[PDB]
Ligand binder design. Structure first.
Ligand code: NHP
Ligand code: NHP
Ligand code: PLP
Ligand code: PLP
Ligand code: NA
Ligand code: NA
Lengths: 264, 387, 387, 264
């Protein structure tokens, strides 16, 4: 119940959660591990980790290249779970969620994929290409292995979707700021959806997509969300400093400090 | 949903939550259109007076001399655009218009779906956005130019392996943020429901015409209908009206490339593994890790790294049979039809002919009434076969 | 002869004495065949089940919006081979077979007649000999290869200007010493009798189908039928069934090239001088001395340096009207049909469309029912127009 | 009546006529004039002259190139008639026949073309591409200007053609040795046709096509023909010695001497 505790703790502090996203193994395994520790050290409340896929159809150019860089480095799903185990061995309480594509979890059995998550210490899993309509087996497998199935609540959702997401989801509800794909390039009135989700006893909502400025996370918290997820803004810093790993870390630090402070 | 998204284990709607309303919308538009005599006559009119429907059924006599095989060819090479792909896009374009949409998004590898999507839009006043992997753009100058001359915007995709795979990716990416005004014209009988069902339904003419045609010319249904399988649209269009006719064999032919053994093929239904991709549960060109692989074939049009769910299903229950043909084999059938029949077949269709040619040659004394779907023209491949 | 070799002053049989029996033979074979219900059904069967007959008549709505012109297009681009030339060679090949002949001799410039002659022979078991001027052979790699792949022997003619002109020469040269076993498949409605009459008769479907088609769709005959004129076969095929319909205008369009004024054109019927050549008395691309000149045009298929005698005759009596269209004009009509109708027209046919487009544009308020003969597909010209 | 006299004279000598063919202006006007004089000096009884055409459809490769060479030299029909006048001014009795294509004679009026022939002193004209069926205007124009219309009698001719050729023709009947085009490359039983033509009071028959050896002309005479026409064998000598005009003449001389002697 890693998310349960983080949110309860954050509430006692009347605080919002800042959750950055990165691709495991970008730009290299060793540098990626280093990035994640910097992310945690600078203040990230939880983590959203993506394992390299050949067809990230819900991702914009920034993360598309994160996958390309990770691939260019020879990172595999096996290598990722190895990475996840070390991260958990290092950081005991920080919630860990995986951004996954369907084939990677269906490949060697759905059940077997979630058992691995439990073994490694993963907390949640969001399968970008599985709608609620198609989530039955993923949900079931997740719950069975004490993994929280993360559901995306889009901005256009009707009452039926909302009631579904609230009932099935766990850990946190992924509130979609926008339509389209993952991108800091474009920004994104979630008041009604957040009240409705709170009304249906849904998991605390985390707003994701386009969140790239300190003001954006404070706005997320003010509306009633428990926090904000930011990815392309982080990945863009890795992209920016490929020739200077040390500079990468220091810049990653300043950004997530600015971002976490804005949720307090 | 109003219809079943699955064919047994196969199919589904594996798309991000955001595209679900766009898929339910499309489905209702289809169920309505399907029951609409006014849509039906509009589509039949375009197929007939614009496309060339009904296409011919040609008895190939010279080719089967000295054997007990009577072979016919469903002439989809005579359809406007030079391929069966035209039937489809016309009906999908009218569906977009029925939906009040005025924009079309398209996916293309060889260039054929793009050219057909572009022509349909030009005719129906739709604005066309087409996505092609950079490797294919460079590889297909003629079709790119044909597309542009038809008023379509061609966009190269440098992401991933820059082919059909990644093109299909940029299409959905775009569609997630534009489904409200744009319709994504998927190019085959695969992808998320309602596409495998829509494409079949809009390609059904083929088999329906063939049945009437063979019943006229021979007073009998065929022993077997054969068609190549890239993603499954021309094949399923041939099969459809004959599925309930249990005495008629349904044979789908997948590219074998350099040889199945070489691992250099495009035969997922038979030699690939089931996975989940492109909003579908279906057999796939996959790595051991679950990473999506590319399909290989002498014919660029059979490069879809997966296959339609209805085929995977028909295969599983034994209703349909799937086989594969290598490059040299397709090259041979290509060469043969040119010289004995005077018809230049697409290398795509040549895989289908090659199998019927085998069925004949291996058993010349077997009485057999065959119908091969010549899904397309081969002028396109004169250069390739030349080199 | 059994039939009149002349159309007023035009036509004739200007061949060396040696080829006369070969022309009288052919004529009797034609008069017999023409009266033969068994030949008639054999030809109708091939046209239908092999070629794609009947071709469509497409109403071009987007193209004529904002004017009082209703335009239709006789879709000869949808015929097997991609041009009206196929109708012809099929009937001429059966005539060769009726004559006990088992060999075909052919003449070709752009490559289109060669490809059609080659396909007909492949289908009908005739041995095909094709003659092409070296300049055209180098210029037409795709069609040469298409011809060879169809089992035809391609022979380059380095004599003279090495084009259609000299090819037509080597054909007759060969035919003089082989008419006993070989039939010379002339590619247009010109040359010595009985060819202008045979080609018309075997291209008549076009106009006959159009009449029935327009009477169905509009309940009225057109105000005018338009067709390009290279040698005159597609045009005459369109005109034929409408000649006795005096209310229907017959408009033939000749290439204007860079401009008539430039002397860089292929418009003999209107801007050339009557002479005697290729076994015919007809208007000609001639020098002041009487030396035969070459016809110029952006479209290689309209390079015949002369024109059919029936056209010259219809022109003289006022029954038909002939005009010309320049390269840029044809290029414009080509571009326009691609974008507003989604049809890629042959540059040959683009000359015909361009004129109908003028008839519209110059007088947008004139009520007009037009039918353009789209004698062919334009995939062939994608490269030319591109550069 | 130049042909009338030559044949009457040749008969009193129980001799056959040897008639060579050449293209006017091949390889040049001046060299061509020189060739023709050599032809006459070595023994030719009559001449068959071709004026350069762009489409000689009844000619094989040898003469095709004669036209090409003449064209390359800038020879025109006007230049030809000029050449013909000088030849007649030089040689008063030798019969002169023109090998013509239809367009060249129809160009500036058929009548006007034959008046020019009469003016220049031409004796006969054979229009290679005009059959008897189409010769009415050419025949009429020729007779009107005292020019003999030459008709080709093919080896396959039926009684009706034979009777036609005999009635219309004048000067000499062109007996076709073979089918096909003009060529020394291939050779070619004209007994019945020659008796029939003699039976119908036809003009003396001259055998043409493939005649390239001394034995061939003696054979022509033995069968009942009044002579033989030879072209490609002559033109081949011009073709052979383009780089040696002097050698050309001496070789042209030896050939026509051998050929004329064989008719005696
Ligand atoms: N990658 C991804 C794709 C689909 C659904 C959720 C995620 S995880 C968070 C992504 C945030 C990226 P960005 O801040 O640029 O919008
Ligand atoms: N040139 C020509 C063409 C048609 C009819 C007569 C002639 S004149 C004599 C030609 C002799 C040429 P060859 O001896 O090679 O057969
Ligand atoms: C487009 C294309 C194909 C691939 O076809 P599917 O029918 O969807 O499998 C096959 N044949 C031709 C000629 C094509 O152009
Ligand atoms: C062959 C060719 C022509 C020239 O035609 P004629 O009809 O004999 O004048 C015209 N259009 C096309 C498409 C051709 O291929
Ligand atoms: Na496939
Ligand atoms: Na012309």
């Amino acid at each position: 119940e890693r998310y349960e505790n983080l949110f309860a703790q954050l509430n006692d502090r009347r605080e919002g959660a800042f959750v950055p996203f990165v691709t495991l193994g970008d730009p290299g395994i060793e540098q990626s591990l280093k990035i994640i520790d910097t992310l945690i050290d600078a203040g990230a409340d939880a983590l959203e980790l993506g394992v390299p896929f050949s067809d990230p159809l819900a991702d914009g150019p920034t993360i598309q290249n994160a996958n390309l860089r990770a691939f260019a480095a020879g990172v595999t799903p096996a290598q990722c779970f190895e990475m996840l185990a070390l991260i958990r061995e290092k950081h005991p309480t920080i919630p860990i969620g995986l951004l996954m594509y369907a084939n990677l979890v269906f490949n060697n059995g759905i059940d077997a994929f979630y058992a691995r998550c439990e073994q490694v210490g993963v907390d949640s899993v969001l399968v970008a290409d599985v709608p609620v309509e198609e989530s039955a087996p993923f949900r079931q497998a997740a719950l069975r292995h004490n993994i929280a199935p993360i559901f995306i609540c889009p901005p256009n959702a009707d009452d039926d979707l909302l009631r579904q997401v609230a009932s099935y989801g766990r850990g946190y509800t992924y509130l979609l700021s926008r339509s389209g794909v993952t991108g800091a390039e474009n920004r994104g009135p979630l008041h009604h959806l957040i009240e409705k989700l709170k009304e249906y006893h849904a998991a605390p909502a985390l707003q994701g997509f386009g969140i790239s400025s300190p003001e954006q996370v404070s706005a997320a918290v003010r509306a009633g969300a428990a926090g904000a997820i930011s990815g392309s803004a982080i990945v863009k810093i890795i992209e920016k400093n490929l020739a200077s790993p040390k500079q990468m870390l220091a810049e990653l630090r300043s950004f997530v400090s600015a971002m976490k402070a804005a949720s307090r | 949903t109003l219809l079943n998204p699955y064919f047994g284990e196969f199919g589904g709607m594996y798309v991000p939550q955001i595209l679900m309303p766009a898929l339910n919308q499309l489905e209702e538009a289809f169920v309505r259109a399907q029951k609409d005599p006014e849509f039906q006559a509009q589509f039949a009119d375009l197929l007939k007076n614009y496309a060339g429907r009904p296409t011919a059924l040609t008895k190939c006599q010279n080719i089967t001399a000295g054997t007990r095989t009577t072979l016919y060819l469903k002439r989809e090479d005579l359809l406007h655009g030079g391929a069966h792909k035209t039937n489809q896009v016309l009906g999908q374009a009218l569906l977009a218009k029925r939906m009040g949409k005025s924009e079309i998004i398209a996916e293309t590898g060889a260039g054929q779906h793009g050219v057909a999507s572009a022509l349909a839009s030009a005719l129906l006043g739709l604005k066309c956005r087409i996505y092609m992997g950079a490797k294919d753009v460079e590889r297909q100058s003629p079709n790119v130019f044909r597309m542009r001359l038809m008023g379509a915007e061609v966009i190269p995709v440098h992401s991933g392996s820059a082919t059909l795979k990644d093109a299909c990716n940029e299409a959905l990416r775009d569609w997630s943020g534009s489904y409200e005004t744009a319709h994504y014209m998927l190019g085959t009988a695969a992808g998320p429901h309602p596409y495998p069902t829509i494409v079949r339904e809009f390609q059904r003419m083929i088999g329906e015409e063939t049945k009437a045609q063979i019943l006229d010319k021979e007073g009998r249904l065929p022993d077997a209908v054969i068609a190549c399988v890239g993603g499954g649209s021309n094949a399923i269009g041939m099969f459809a009206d004959f599925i309930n006719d249990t005495s008629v064999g349904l044979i789908g032919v997948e590219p074998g490339g350099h040889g199945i053994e070489t691992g250099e093929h495009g035969a997922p239904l038979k030699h690939g593994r089931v996975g989940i991709y492109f909003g579908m549960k279906a057999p796939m060109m996959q790595t051991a890790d679950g990473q999506i692989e590319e399909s290989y074939s002498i014919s660029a049009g059979l490069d879809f790294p997966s296959v339609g769910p209805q085929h995977a299903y028909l295969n599983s229950i034994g209703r349909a049979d799937y086989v594969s043909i290598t490059d040299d084999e397709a090259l041979e059938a290509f060469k043969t039809l040119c010289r004995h029949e005077g018809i230049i077949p697409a290398l795509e269709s040549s895989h289908a002919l090659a199998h019927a040619l085998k069925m004949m040659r291996e058993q010349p004394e077997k009485e057999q009434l065959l119908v091969v779907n010549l899904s397309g023209r081969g002028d396109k491949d004169i250069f390739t076969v030349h080199d």
